[PDB]
Structures are given as C-alpha cells and as structure tokens.
Amino acid sequence: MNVSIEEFTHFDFQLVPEPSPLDLVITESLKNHIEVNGVKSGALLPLPFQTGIGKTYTALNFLLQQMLEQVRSELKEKSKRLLYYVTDSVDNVVSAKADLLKLIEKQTVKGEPRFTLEQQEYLKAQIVHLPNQSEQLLQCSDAVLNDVLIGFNLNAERDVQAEWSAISGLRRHASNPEVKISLNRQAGYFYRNLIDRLQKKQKGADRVLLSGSLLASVETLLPGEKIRNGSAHVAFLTTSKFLKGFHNTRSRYSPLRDLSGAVLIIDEIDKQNQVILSELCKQQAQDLIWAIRTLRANFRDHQLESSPRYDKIEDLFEPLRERLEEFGTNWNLAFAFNTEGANLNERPVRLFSDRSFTHVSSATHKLSLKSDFLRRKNLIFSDEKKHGLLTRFVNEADVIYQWFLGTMRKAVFQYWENVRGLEINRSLEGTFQEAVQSLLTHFNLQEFESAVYESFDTRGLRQSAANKLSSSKSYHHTGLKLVEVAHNQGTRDTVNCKASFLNTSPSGVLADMVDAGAVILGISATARADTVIHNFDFKYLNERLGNKLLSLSREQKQRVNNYYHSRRNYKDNGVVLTVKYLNSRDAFLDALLEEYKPEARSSHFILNHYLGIAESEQAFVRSWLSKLLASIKAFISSPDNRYMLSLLNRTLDTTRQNINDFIQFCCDKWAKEFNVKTKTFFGVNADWMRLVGYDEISKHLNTELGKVVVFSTYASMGAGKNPDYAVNLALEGESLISVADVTYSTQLRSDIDSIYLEKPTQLLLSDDYSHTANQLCQFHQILSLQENGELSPKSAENWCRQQLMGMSRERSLQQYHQTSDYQSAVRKYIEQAVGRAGRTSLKRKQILLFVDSGLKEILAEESRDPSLFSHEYVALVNKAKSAGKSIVEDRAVRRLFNLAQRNNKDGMLSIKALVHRLHNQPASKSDIQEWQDIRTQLLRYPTVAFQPERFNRLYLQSMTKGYYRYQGNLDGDPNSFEFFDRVPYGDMVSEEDCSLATLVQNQYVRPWFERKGFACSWQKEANVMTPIMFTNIYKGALGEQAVEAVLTAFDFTFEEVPNSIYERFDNRVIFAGIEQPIWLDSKYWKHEGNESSEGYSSKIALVEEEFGPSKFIYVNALGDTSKPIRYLNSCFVETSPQLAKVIEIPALIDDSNADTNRTAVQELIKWLHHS
Amino acid sequence: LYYVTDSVDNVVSAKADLLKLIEKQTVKGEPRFTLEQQEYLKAQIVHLPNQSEQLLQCSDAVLNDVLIGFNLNAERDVQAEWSAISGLRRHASNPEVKISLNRQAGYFYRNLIDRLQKKQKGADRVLLSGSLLASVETLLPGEKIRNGSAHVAFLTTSKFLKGFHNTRSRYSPLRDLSGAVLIIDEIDKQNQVILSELCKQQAQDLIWAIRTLRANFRDHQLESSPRYDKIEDLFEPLRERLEEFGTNWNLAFAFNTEGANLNERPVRLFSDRSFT
Amino acid sequence: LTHFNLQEFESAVYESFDTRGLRANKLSSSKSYHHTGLKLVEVAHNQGTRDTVNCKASFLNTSPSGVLADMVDAGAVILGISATAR
Amino acid sequence: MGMSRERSLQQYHQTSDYQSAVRKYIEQAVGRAGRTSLKRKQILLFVDSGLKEILAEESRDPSLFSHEYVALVNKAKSAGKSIVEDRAVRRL
DNA sequence: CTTTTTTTTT
DNA sequence: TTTTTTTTTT
Ligand SMILES: Nc1ncnc2c1ncn2[C@@H]1O[C@H](COP(=O)(O)OP(=O)(O)OP(O)(O)=S)[C@@H](O)[C@H]1O
Ligand SMILES: [Mg+2]
C-alpha cells in the first residue's frame, strides 16, 4: 500500500507530549548549541545519568520528534536528514527498533491514539534496520530472490544459479543446528557475489528500471536502497556495521564520508571505544620499500591531463615529486635491500615508533644501512663503534607514504570542487570513487587503489593538511607504527619492510566525526568514566572540541536528580538492599562434590575426571565456582526472591556441560531442601539471545511458579538490556511494592531481584584477528596510558620494549593491574552490571546483591561525587567502605609528575630532531619558520594562564605557580628527570636565574623588548616552560635579542644568516660600509661551552670555505664589565689583535648594576675600523 | 608414469583395471606376485582427484591428526571452517546438501593446504613420520610422489594441466616432463580439453603493463652477485626497446577516445599476429 | 621480480610459465598458427572514470598441437591411444 | 561483429572438417558394441537417417575399421557414389 | 538456421 | 602471574 505524506496535512504538529526533564536536557542543550555555534556546526552531548532512568526512551522520543519535524518540513515544501541509532550489540539494536515501533503504535495523546493507522504505517516505513549480509540474505524469502534474479537477468549466469541452488537446498533442511553454521557463511558469500553483479549491472548503460514488484524486492534485499532513493531516513545498526557501511544498488555507502548534518544516537558510547579500535587494527600492512620504489618510478614522468576537471590538482603533487626525487637520490633506490652479517637472520628486525619521541628497536645494536655500488645492493648491517641508520630510512619512508595518502585526499576534494562546477547536486561521496580512479589511472598507480580507499575509510574522516612544535600535539591524531624487516617470501637475498600503522585513536575518530558536522548523543551511565582503555579520552576531546562538547548546567542536573529520586524512592517504600561479599569457602565445595559422586576417591578425582578440569587450573575453578554456589544457595534460601542473574566472565555453554551438570545437581538438591521449584537458564549469550529470545525467561516468570536462575556474562548482559518480566499478581505474594511517588507506567513489570557479580578479569583488550592486530592493540593501549598521564615515560618505554620482545599476556595484565585506570575500569564494569537490577519501579522489599570479595578493596577506593550513582551502587560502595579502611592515594599529582616528564622528553626529542634538520644544508623554509616560531613564542609567553592548544609541549603544569625544581642531565637520558617535590634541592626554572629583570634594566634592551612585545616579566601562571626550552631555547633568544638591541644603537646592521650556514652563527653584521662580511655568535652569559677549539675551528673552516675570509665576534650578553676583551685566532690561541680573526667580549651589559659596557663596544668598533 | 584421460570414470576404471591385473595375473598356473609383492606394487600407484573429492574421502581421524600435528587447531576461522565441514558431513541429505558440501570441501581444502605449505616452507618445519606421515600422505597423494614412495599417477587432463599439491608447493607436471612416460587414452578428445584451459587465461591491460615496464626498467638494477651472472644482459635489449617505444608513443600521458562511434560501442581488434 | 620491483607481474609470469613451461615471426623461420597464436584487444573506458581508456588484451600464445609438440620436445614419451587418433 | 551460434554452426557445416568430425563421433560411438567375443547372433543398429549421406562419403582404407562401422558404411553406401570434390585439390 | 555435456579451481 | 566475549567481512 503506497503511503504518501498527504495524510499528515491535518496532523497538528504543535501538540506534543509532556516534556520530561530528560527531554528538556536534550532539547535545551541542542537549541543553545544551534543558536550559538550555528546550524551547520557539529556537537557531542554526553548524557551520563543513572542506569534505568529513561535515557533510551528519551532518545527514541527524540528520534520520533525528529521524524515528525522532517515530515512537517516536507509538507511545507530538499534531501532527507539522516538519523542513525548505533550500539555495539545486535540485541540492543533490535530491542531499540522494536521499542520505537511500540512507541509509534501505542503513543496516545489525551485518551486517543496520536497516529492513525496510515500515519503509523508511513512512519514505520521510514525506519530501516541494517544487519550483516548473512542475516540480510537469510531473512528474505525465495520469491524475493527469484524476483530479483529474473528482473536483473542473472539466472542466465552459471555460477550464480549454482550458488543460489546450493543456498536454497541447504536452507530447506535447516532444522538441524549444524546446517545453520556453514549456511551463514555461504549466505554471506552469495550476498557478496549477487550484490557485486547487481551493482555492476546498475552502473552501466544497461541500467534496469526499478519500480513496482522489482523495486519492492530489491528494497527488501537491499535496505540501504531505501535510504539512497529517499524512502527512509532512519537507520538502526551496530557500530561495526556503521564503520563498514552498507550497500545500495549503485555502490557501498560509507556513512563516515557523509556526516554533515546527520544525527547520531550512540548508546553506550564508552563501549564503542574498543569497537572502533578493533576496526582500526584490521588495516592491511604495506611493504614500504615496494611502495616508495613504485611512487618514485611512476612520478618521474606521468602527468595529468590539462583539463578544467583537473584544475589546481597538478600543483598539489609537485612537492611530493621533488621530495621523492631527493629521497631516491639520497637512499639509492635503484638498488634493492638485503641484510648482512650474523644475528640478523635468526629473528627478523622489529621497530616500533610513536612517531614523536618513543622509539624501540628489537635489534641489540643500532642497525646501519649502506650502499655497495660494486655489488649494486643496499645492505642492512651492524656496525662496530648519522644519516645511514635504518630507523631514519624507515621514518622518512613512512612520512612519504602518509604524505602521498594525504595529497590523494586533498586532490579528491579538489576534483569534487572542479566537477561540481563542470557538471552544472552530486555529493562528495558520489564522486569520490571516480576521482580516485581517474587520478590513479592518470598516474599509473592503480596498485594503491585499495590503500587509498581504506585511507578514506579510517583517518579519511581526517580532512587534515601535523607533528610540529607549533601545532597541537597528541597521540590521538598522530598514531603509531610497527615495521618488520624480514626476508621476502621465496627469495633469500632481499628483505621487505612490512609496516602497520595506526593513524588515529578512537578519540580521534570521534573528534573528526564531530568536526565533520555530525550531532552525536552519547548515552551511557559511564560516559565520563576515568579510563582511557575502556572509554574515550575526554580530556583530549574537551581540549580539541572546545565548546562543541556540550555541557549540562547545575540546574539541569539537579532537575534530573530530582526526577530520578522521585521515581526510585526506596527509603519511603521500605525497600532494603542486602549486600554480601563472598569468599572461596572451599570447605563447602568439597562436601558438595563429595555428595555429587560418593563413589569417587576424593574431590580431586571428581574435578580431574568427572568435571574434566586439569590439575593446574583446578584451584582457579575451585575458587570461582564455589563463590557462585554460595550465591545460588543464598538465593534459594531466600523465600521471597524469584529472579536471579549471575554475571560471570565465561559462558556456561555446552562446552563446559560437565560443570553445568554439577551446577544443575546442586540446584536440584537445594530445590529439594527448601521445596521451591527452580529453573536454570544456561548459556545465555548473544547467539542464544538471537535464536531463543529472552522473552522465554519472561514467559516462565509470568506463568510458572518458583525461582529462576540465569547464567550470562558481562559481554552479553551488562550494558543496555532491560531484563524485566511481566508481573502476575497471583504468582507474587506481599512482596512487590511500588517505589515511585506518582505512577508513571502502564502494565506491571518487575526487574531482577537477586544478582551475583563476579570480578571482571580480562580488562586489557586483545585482538584475535591476527598477530599484527594484537600487537597494534597492545601498543595503542600503552601509548594511551602514557598520553593520559597514568604511565611515566620510563615505564611506558620499558613496557613497549617488553611488548616488542614478546611478553606474555599474563605479564601485560600484571602491568596494567598496577594503574588507576584498571580500578576505574573495574568500577565502571561493576556499576553498569549492578545497574541491570534497577529498571522498574516495582521493587521487592529485599534485594540480594552477592559480590566477589576480590572487588571489596576496589569498590572501597571510589571517591567521586555520589550524587550521580544509583541506589545499588551506593549500597555496594557504602558496604565496602564500612567493612574496613583504605589509604586513599592521590591521582592528579602523579599524573602531573608523569606529564611533566612526558612534556620534557617530547621537547628534548623534538628540539634535537629540529636542530639536526637545520644543520643539514640547505635548510627548508618550514624548519626556519618553526625555529623562529618557537623562539618568538617562548619570548612573548614564558608562562601562559590557560592550557595552551598551540605550543602545549613547550609548557608543563607545575605544583608551584611561577617556578619549579627539577633534576636531570639535559644532555643525557630524558627518562631520568625529576620534578617538583621529589627534588627539594634541585635547579630552578624562574626569573631569578634568568636575571631577566637585571637584563631589562639596560637603557637599550628595554625599548627593544617593549617594541617587540617580548615579556619583561614572568607572569605567575601555572603553565611554565620545560627545562629543555628554558636552557636551550629561551636563554639563547634572550641573549641574542639583548645583544642585537645593544649593538643596533651603535649603527650596526644585522642580516639573516644564509640557509647553508644556519644555526652556525646568530646573525650577519655589516657596519660603517665595511665590505668584509661579519658573523655574529651571541650568547646569553658565560655558563660552560663544551665546544672546544676543534668544533669551533671546524665551524670557522666551513664558513670561510663558503664565504671566504671574514671576522668573527664571540660575545656574551651578560657578565662582568671589568673582564678584558680577548683576541683569538681561528685555532682559539691568543695573539696580537691585528692577527686575530675572532674577538671575544666577556659582556655587553653589567649584571651587578645593569650598566651598558660602553668601553667594550667602543673597542670592538675601533678594532672593526682597524680590520 | 602418468595415465591421463578426459573423464573421471575412465580414470577410476583404468586404475581398478590395473589393480585387478596386479591381483590376478598368472604365470604358468601360479600367481605372479605374492601378497606382499602385490601390496608393494599397489602402494606404488596413486590417484589424484579434484580437491573437493580429495578432502571428502578423508576420515575425521585423518584430518584431526593432520590439524593436531601441524598445530593448526587453534587458528580461529580454520577450526570454524572445519567444524562446519564435519557438521555438513554428518547429516549428508539429498544432493541439495551435497552441492554445498562439495563447494565448501574444495574451499576448505585449498585454505588448509595453503597454511600447511606456508608452515612447511618456514623455519618451523614439522617432521613427518609414522601416523602424521600416513595421514598427510592420505590427505595429499602428491606428497607420495614428492617423497618417492610412488611413481605412477592416474588423473584427468584437467588435473594434469593444473597440477597437484605436496607439502612444499604445487607440482606442475608440465615443467618436469623430461624422462617421463605419459599414457594418454583417447588423445584426440584431449585437443578440446587443452583448448578449454588455454582460453581460461586472464586478460591484461596493455597500457598499464607497458607503462609499468617502462617506469620500472628505467633505473632498477640486479645485484652483482654470482647467482645473477649474465642475467642483466638478457634484459638490456628490452630496456633499450622500452625507452624507444615510450619516446615514440609519448607514454608520459594517458589515453582517451573522442568523437562518434567510439563511445557507444568499445573498439575490438583481432590479430592473427601474421596476416589476419 | 623483487629486484626489478615488478611483483605485480608475478601472476602473469606464473601462468605464462604454466602455458609455456615446455619451451618467432620471421619469413626465415618455420611459421605456423600453432606456435604463434592470436590476440583479441578491447579498447574501452576505464571502470569508474570517464576520461581514460584501457586496452584489455586476451592472448592465445599456442594451440593444443603446439602444446603437445612442446611436450614431446621437452623429453616426454607419449602413447596416444584412440581408434580415432588420426 | 557478434554472429549467432547458429550462424557459426551454419558456416562450419560447409566444411569437410565437419564431416570428418561426424564420422569420427559415429565410429567411436558404434565401437561401444564390440567389447567382447561373446556376441548375440543378431545385433540391431538404429542410426539417424540424417547421417546416411555423411556415412556415404567414407573414403579411407577400410582395413582399419571395425565390423559395425564397415557395415554402417556399406549400408549407407548402398545408394551408390555421389560426386564430391577432392579434398587435396581444394586444400592446395 | 541450429538444437550440449564435460573437468578443474575458484 | 592471570584465568573472554563480541561484530563484521571475508
Ligand atoms: N514514560 C516512561 N519514561 C521513562 N521510561 C519508561 C517510560 N515508559 C517505559 N519506560 C521504560 O523504562 C525503562 C528504563 O529503561 P531505559 O529507559 O531503557 O533505561 P536507561 O535509563 O536508558 O538506562 P541504560 O540504557 O541501561 S545505561 C525502560 O523499560 C523503558 O522502556
Ligand atoms: Mg541505553
């Protein structure tokens, strides 16, 4: 029945249901965001309220109001606004879709249904659900497939009909449960093939016309075709499906490329952190040697067409072409690569790079790389003792590869700009595939076609342009890299460098999603958990998004708290939560095992033989099983409780059926002991929940009389399930009591009445996809813990080194158990799991909570504001705290110590790399500007009031307000630095040792400092410079500026130093029309210059060779004015003034009274006249 | 020694006829071969069917022995695939199930042999003997040829042109034909079979291939080791030809058409390469 | 192929060896269709782009009789059994 | 240009290659009744009549044929001889 | 105007 | 020394 919008004309769009406080929480924040940041701006709104308060019901009412607003827009009149509902589990997707359909059906306004049957049918026609391809194929009938095959003329093909006949035959005898497996696999492969040929047919000139039955059948087979043609604009799907996209008749639609204006509702947003991570680690490794040799070979000559379509694109690739020419010249890319020597063949070389300051190599010795022109080979060898290291080559090749992928993204966007004007309503995603194909075909780089596509998929969300001390630096938009250097397959004389990259973290992906223009509603009670492993980094998201990260006011949070406490009034309704912490108590499991099999020798024999548990793992099974039994008995002993849920870490499916039999035996015994009927539901997982619905449990409690025990896990029943059941008053005595103060629900429902919470175990994420994926996931978690501040840079480097050498998973878990991130993840899991018993307002008078005693200390360490917790979590925390006493340790000061060490180490490594790039002549403009920007910034802002977002790595947060203490070798190990209170007799970073006030009392320095805008005082701001920037940059700029100011008053002219002699001397001096060039090397004060006459004489030799004879000035800005002015030759030997090429001045401004050394300047001027 | 014919039925009938000849051949009223001689001679003959048929005739004990002996059990999807295959085996219904079982048996056999070979080529080479050797020789009949246990093969022309598998790689019998004896039965019908294999070759984009050859032969060099002796002199004329062709035809640019009768239908050219 | 950076021809090299693991057009050599073959080239627009073409070429480098003669030249002794062998 | 399979088959039917292929298939198929030395006293062969003219043009040496194929040829040839062009002169 | 089945890997 | 399940394409 074709439903139009003509039946919504008489609909009254201004009559809306009563807005709850949660509805005003979403609406007021979104209307303020629109009225402030603009209509086209994206936003991220986390909603971290109590479990079971009504956040998903409010998100589905918000989705229904968006659908009604869109219908009104089409009535008044454009393309459809896309609404997505995303969560990590399939069960929550289908439950939310059925809840929205129930909302449309059963919503009544003032005693009458809101929507007529035709309005309901249209609204339901606007919602789609996008499952995996096996579920999409298996859920549509044989008539639909035969209609599609006939309409598209595909039964003529032989392979297609053979595969479809096999599918229909296998699915006919689908009663057996092992046919269902290997039917999903073939359904997915057939769906791939059929959609590939359907799209190939639909893209050519022989494009079929779709209407009537063929259209309805292809919209049934391809739900994304409904979205493509504008029939639907609401989609329900999982996070992994959202990250992979779906299919329409034309191509595969990626929602991440078309997020401008979309609305995303991400339920349990924190658990999506790991899901996105699991996708980022699935990327394919690339051979960097082949990739760079191919890029260099195909960029020598190939040219784009001179067409208006390719306007402005050829200028994007010119810098990459010059870079490739110089890289291939420097590293001799005409030859291939092989290793040389011993110990390089037993195990391949593995290299790990943070890409900023963490570099770990598996080689014992630093590996070099030399070119043998006689052998025509590049040899990776180990030396016996510059620009010949393997790490340098690998880092530059990774930079060039990422530069190529970034310039491909820029050229695709420029192509879309040119073709929009040439084609004069085609989207950036519509033309993306044509742009990539045309560019790669023109450059003969079609082998990168896959690499470019996945590049758009992940960090392709990055419309970027960076790893400079002038940008905002973070691990989350930088990533990591793991390179394996091993021999090629088959060959025994060449090696490859297989590199795996993470170009962004999940928090980077979310931030780029908000920057794309999406409005994202993050719904979870743990949306602001203080972990970076099991949640996003919200300190990074706050710093990056700014005011696009919408916040809720104190009044709104008070209204929500009043809303929650007015519907969950436990204290006034006589409801008691009884918490019990259970130990192993093995003296009871031994008796239970004895009564299970009286004929056996002892319980060790029963466990080893009857239950099938090995001797090594018996003790663990002895501890977790007995705790479970101690909870079951206490539930059975309770006369009034009916519903129990036991959340474990492992599924009790048929694989552990022997243990299930033991558990079933024990339950039957207790059923006999108390004369209560009990039913146990084993193996309640995702597959069970899709095959056998959870309503069966709800059916049992509705009809049968007795108790029910459910055995599920955290991974299946811990985040968003509503496990309530319909209440039959005849099956419940005087036990249920309503705890809300004004009834708010139709139908009587009650929730879980007893719960057993095991301690979550495998809290450090893993990846079973491959070995590379698990390596990337482990290095991502170490770098996230170092970037947040939970790990010292020394401990993070030691953990990255043990990870590169192949540490065991138990050692990793032991290292992660030592952080506070682990405790915040444990409390997050406990709070979410305990929130499954708080869904309804019909409560039992007593609710039994049985908790693993291994959680007792952890729950005792909870110290957040208790104004946001649920009642059960407050009961758990109060019980744990009242049980004993714990020593509370501070977490912000350890983070400040770690982040001071981190910032100092990053500044050290970046400064050394930048100076090394400066010393390699010629020096590019970018490096010169970067050096000047650092010196300018540190001169203008030695301290900053707020946390910087441009030079963040130049500053650290200090305990004190304008100074701090430190200890460390500034030319040694950056991992051995100490700060603040750990060193009470260390050095200082302040104004007192600067002598800045002493320096600026000079009559000529002060006007220069005032004109330039340089600070003459250190503002007492908590963000102060790092010791590296204090000593190697700031004081050098202070001395150079003071010397230049003093000399410029004496008619001295200064020029920029040529790029080939940069960083060698401060400035170039021209005075009194002297044709002899003068070179200036200015220092702040005397200190200690370790450069002996060797390095200085080498510098003089280099400058004299470049520019002939010249004079030199070795001047110190500050010092004693009574000291003599000395004359030295190029060999630093004292001689007569007339035969000395270098004159050294001890000082230019006095330090004891701040008086300019006029005599020394006069003598220098006179000697210059003599020169 | 190879026995080749077009049809599978003639292969199995000729193998059973040779085995019957070994069994009941007589010389002057007494059997020619004792039972142990007969068992040795029969052990020298193998039959190489398609991969789905090779896998579907291996019992569950043989395949679990192979998976255990190569540490292939704990490798995720492989066990997922194998668990599915054995399930389809147990409930083999009417041919509706059987077409699917054959397709998945062939795909699983290809994957399993690919990983067995990549394991045998690396430094973690498993030692094969006893039960493990007998099981892998049952799963891979060409492993018997590679070892030297057997030297008589019965197979079809399609299998002979495709080759078979051992633990190391895929053995192509056409590359090692020196000194072999081939018995091709119904040789005339093999004319069409070989033809149907020659037409299966994959098309090549000539513009991409020549632009790649020109880009990569410009500067890249072989090593100056003894193992590459006088190989670069084989490629020098091809490099000079490539540089001259690229200069003449302006291979720095890409190619496009223009005008009528060129867009509506693609252009097809046929060449005998001599005069047609 | 690794030394020349032409690993994208690896499949092409393997199949060519498959067809020609047993081994000119000059009026001075023996000429025949059975050792030279034929070629069919299709010139069409590249898939996805509207401004470049490709020349997809399919070759037959030998006939079945050329394959059989190459087999005998490689050193195989072949017994051809059929009533219609000639 | 894209001719139809029936137009290829029409063009191939005009060659003597087609007739040697037809007679090769017939002789091989008829050779399936000559496997043993225990024979029925009468053997019945029923051949499509649209084959008789083809079988009428056998000209090879009959010393290599089987008995059933010799009888098939003699029966088709019983209508006599039809004028045909020498294959060697046209091949020349 | 002519009028299909066959093997193998995928 | 710690002690798993989940989604999607292939
Ligand atoms: N008028 C109503 N207002 C609020 N909730 C309602 C209302 N009517 C029914 N509900 C149900 O109230 C229960 C509360 O569950 P949700 O609203 O799904 O929970 P939640 O607050 O989102 O907690 P999460 O998702 O587990 S962290 C659900 O069963 C809702 O479907
Ligand atoms: Mg929810």
Side-chain angles (χ1 to χ4, degrees), chain A residues 20 22 49-58 61 99 267-268 523-526 563 567-568 719-722 724 744-746 749 832 835-836 838-840:
Chain A
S20 58
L22 284 164
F49 300 129
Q50 293 101 326
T51 48
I53 199 190
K55 286 158 326 206
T56 294
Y57 179 85
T58 314
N61 255 296
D99 204 314
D267 222 317
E268 305 307 321
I523 301 147
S524 188
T526 55
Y563 179 77
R567 313 204 322 177
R568 301 284 189 276
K721 288 215 47 94
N722 294 86
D724 36 46
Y744 74 90
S745 188
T746 44
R749 294 196 90 76
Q832 278 281 352
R836 314 261 67 71
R839 328 296 298 162
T840 74

Side-chain angles (χ1 to χ4, degrees), chain A residues 169 172 178 182 186 296-298 300-303 334 374-376 441-442 444 446-447 493 768-769, chain B residues 76 81 84 87 91 96 100 104 208 211-212 214-215 218-224 227-228 232 252:
Chain A
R172 242 193 280 300
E178 87 304 330
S182 92
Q186 303 169 16
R296 172 174 162 270
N298 289 300
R300 188 242 320 175
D301 261 35
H302 300 344
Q303 279 152 89
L374 260 303
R375 291 177 47 180
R376 274 130 57 120
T441 291
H442 273 84
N444 206 67
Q446 292 107 319
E447 326 91 33
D493 55 358
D768 311 317
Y769 181 77
Chain B
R76 258 216 317 166
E81 198 171 20
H91 325 251
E96 295 270 52
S100 56
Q104 321 285 121
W208 169 87
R211 274 173 108 208
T212 304
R214 196 182 84 114
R218 170 199 83 241
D219 51 325
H220 297 163
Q221 317 257 56
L222 278 161
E223 205 203 335
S224 278
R227 74 186 333 122
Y228 298 102
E232 312 90 331

